Amino acid sequence: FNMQCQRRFYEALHDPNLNEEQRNAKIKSIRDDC
Amino acid sequence: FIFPPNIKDVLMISLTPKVTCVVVDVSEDDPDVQISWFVNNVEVHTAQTQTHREIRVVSTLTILHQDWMSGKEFKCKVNPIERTISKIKGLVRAPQVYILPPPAEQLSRKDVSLTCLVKGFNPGDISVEWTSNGHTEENYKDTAPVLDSDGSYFIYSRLNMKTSKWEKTDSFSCNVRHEGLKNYYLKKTIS
Amino acid sequence: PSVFIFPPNIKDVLMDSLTPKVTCVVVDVSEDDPDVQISWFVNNVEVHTAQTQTHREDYNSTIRVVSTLPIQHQDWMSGKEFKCKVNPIERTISKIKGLVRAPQVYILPPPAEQLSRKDVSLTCLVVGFNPGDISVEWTSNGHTEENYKDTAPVLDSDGSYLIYSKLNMKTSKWEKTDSFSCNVRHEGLKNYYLKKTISRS
Numbered sequence: 001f002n003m004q005c006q007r008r009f010y011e012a013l014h015d016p017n018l019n020e021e022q023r024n025a026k027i028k029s030i031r032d033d034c
Numbered sequence: 035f036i037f038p039p040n041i042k043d044v045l046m047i048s049l050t051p052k053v054t055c056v057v058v059d060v061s062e063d064d065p066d067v068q069i070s071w072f073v074n075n076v077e078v079h080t081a082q083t084q085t086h087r088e089i090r091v092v093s094t095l096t097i098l099h100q101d102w103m104s105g106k107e108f109k110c111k112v113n114p115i116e117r118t119i120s121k122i123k124g125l126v127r128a129p130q131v132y133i134l135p136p137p138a139e140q141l142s143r144k145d146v147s148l149t150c151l152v153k154g155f156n157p158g159d160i161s162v163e164w165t166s167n168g169h170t171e172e173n174y175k176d177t178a179p180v181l182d183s184d185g186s187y188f189i190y191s192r193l194n195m196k197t198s199k200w201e202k203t204d205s206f207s208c209n210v211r212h213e214g215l216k217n218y219y220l221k222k223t224i225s
Numbered sequence: 226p227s228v229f230i231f232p233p234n235i236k237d238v239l240m241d242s243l244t245p246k247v248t249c250v251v252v253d254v255s256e257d258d259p260d261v262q263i264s265w266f267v268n269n270v271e272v273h274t275a276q277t278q279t280h281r282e283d284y285n286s287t288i289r290v291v292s293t294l295p296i297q298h299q300d301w302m303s304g305k306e307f308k309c310k311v312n313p314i315e316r317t318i319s320k321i322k323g324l325v326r327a328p329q330v331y332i333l334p335p336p337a338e339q340l341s342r343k344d345v346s347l348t349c350l351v352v353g354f355n356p357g358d359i360s361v362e363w364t365s366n367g368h369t370e371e372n373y374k375d376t377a378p379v380l381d382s383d384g385s386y387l388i389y390s391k392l393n394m395k396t397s398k399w400e401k402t403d404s405f406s407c408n409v410r411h412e413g414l415k416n417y418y419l420k421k422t423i424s425r426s
């Protein structure tokens with residue numbers, strides 16, 4: 001199981017220092033890179 | 035009838051969550067159903083619409099994982115009848131997960147049952163899957179979530195196998211996905 | 226107003242001690258004309274033993290009329306047809322005759338990781354039965370245990386059903402008590418009954 005991207009996803013989904021625009025971009029990056 | 039994304043599709047970044055909309059009471063002779071979609075009152079156009087008959091129409095919209103966890107509205111207008119949906123902000127309890135070995139009196143059968151008990155969770159949306167040594171196990175059934183006296187849910191999953199496999203296989207794993215879990219993922223393993 | 230008809234409870238059918246009953250329900254009756262006449266027919270032969278009553282449904286401010294016909298165990302199992310006539314509306318119910326396969330019953334003891342805590346779960350596994358109508362209840366050497374929940378029957382790839390039941394108790398009770406029993410009622414068992422027992426020690 002790809003625990004890395006899931007954990008990046010999870011961490012990024014709950015990251016307070018990111019705005020909705022930056023959140024969606026980070027998630028899309030994680031989602032597309034893996 | 036509108037429907038939420040499957041819980042596993044929502045919690046896994048490697049999956050594609052879909053909000054579904056189904057139209058009931060439609061004839062075979064006038065099947066042209068125009069279905070629109072909105073995300074927080076903003077029209078989107080990337081919806082897949084196929085047809086079926088008993089006639090009902092299944093329109094599928096792809097959505098962002100976070101947009102459901104953040105609880106945006108998802109409405110499908112039909113022509114007009116309008117149904118919305120979103121994720122309820124409710125109580126969240128993470129599941130306790132136990133594996134029960136087969137009952138002793140079953141070990142003299144051809145088949146044995148491996149039981150996963152997942153309990154004490156909120157809300158009732160959960161995903162339970164099986165693996166052995168990392169390979170996918172497909173021969174299993176699960177119960178629907180049941181409300182427990184304390185207000186939580188429990189579920190049983192039964193992995194059915196030949197007794198040869200039970201005795202010769204190193205390990206089996208119950209894989210749970212729920213929003214109460216860190217990373218939305220937990221794996222319990224038995225040998 | 227519409228009408229619905231309901232089969233008796235499986236536990237009432239299997240236990241001779243209990244009276245099974247067919248039930249006819251007329252929903253959305255009007256307050257203006259509360260006159261609902263309901264007659265019963267066992268194999269097109271009229272019976273006159275049903276008790277009828279009216280219910281106010283506070284959920285949505287509607288009225289409900291429900292007719293309950295007490296039937297004999299043999300007639301239901303032999304596939305006799307039961308029909309209620311409401312005035313005309315007719316509804317018919319009869320036992321679904323099909324494959325009959327007796328369940329196997331197992332009691333799974335609490336998982337080891339749960340014995341460290343102060344409550345434990347006892348699990349009853351019931352598999353490979355047809356039809357899906359079944360009764361599972363727990364006892365403590367005969368005495369009724371009530372802190373338990375069943376699941377709905379699930380259709381296996383076998384074509385048969387399986388069902389689980391979870392009895393909850395404190396770990397202390399699980400050690401102090403002599404034994405516990407999963408009691409199963411199904412039409413495929415001898416005498417419609419089977420008792421599996423487990424003991425901690």
Ligand SMILES: *[C@@H]1O[C@H](CO[C@@H]2O[C@@H](C)[C@@H](O)[C@@H](O)[C@@H]2O)[C@@H](O[C@@H]2O[C@H](CO)[C@@H](O[C@@H]3O[C@H](CO[C@H]4O[C@H](CO)[C@@H](O)[C@H](O)[C@@H]4O[C@@H]4O[C@H](CO)[C@@H](O)[C@H](O)[C@H]4NC(C)=O)[C@@H](O)[C@H](O[C@H]4O[C@H](CO)[C@@H](O)[C@H](O)[C@@H]4O[C@@H]4O[C@H](CO)[C@@H](O)[C@H](O)[C@H]4NC(C)=O)[C@@H]3O)[C@H](O)[C@H]2NC(C)=O)[C@H](O)[C@H]1NC(C)=O
Pocket residue numbers: 228229231232234248250252253282284285286287289
């Ligand atoms: C005002 O409120 C009342 C009450 O609403 C009910 O109670 C409140 C508290 C809420 O929880 C509501 O959600 C709840 O529904 C409304 O009255 C209801 O009206 C609906 C119709 O819209 C009826 O639905 C039917 O239900 C039966 C199953 O009924 C059981 O389960 C219901 C819960 O879903 C429960 O409410 C019932 O009481 C009943 O429960 C059983 O009762 C018996 C007897 O007391 C008991 O022994 C059992 O132990 C108990 N079991 C359980 C689990 O509770 C369902 O079978 C019907 O489906 C048929 O009919 C549909 C058409 O309406 C059709 O589309 C279906 O396909 C199906 O058709 C049948 O198909 C089979 C084979 O395929 C065939 O053999 C049949 O002939 C065929 N029948 C027909 C007619 O074609 C249906 O879904 C509710 O029963 C009823 N509730 C009550 C309490 O009467 C009322 O509508 C409200 N008024 C307004 C204006 O809104």
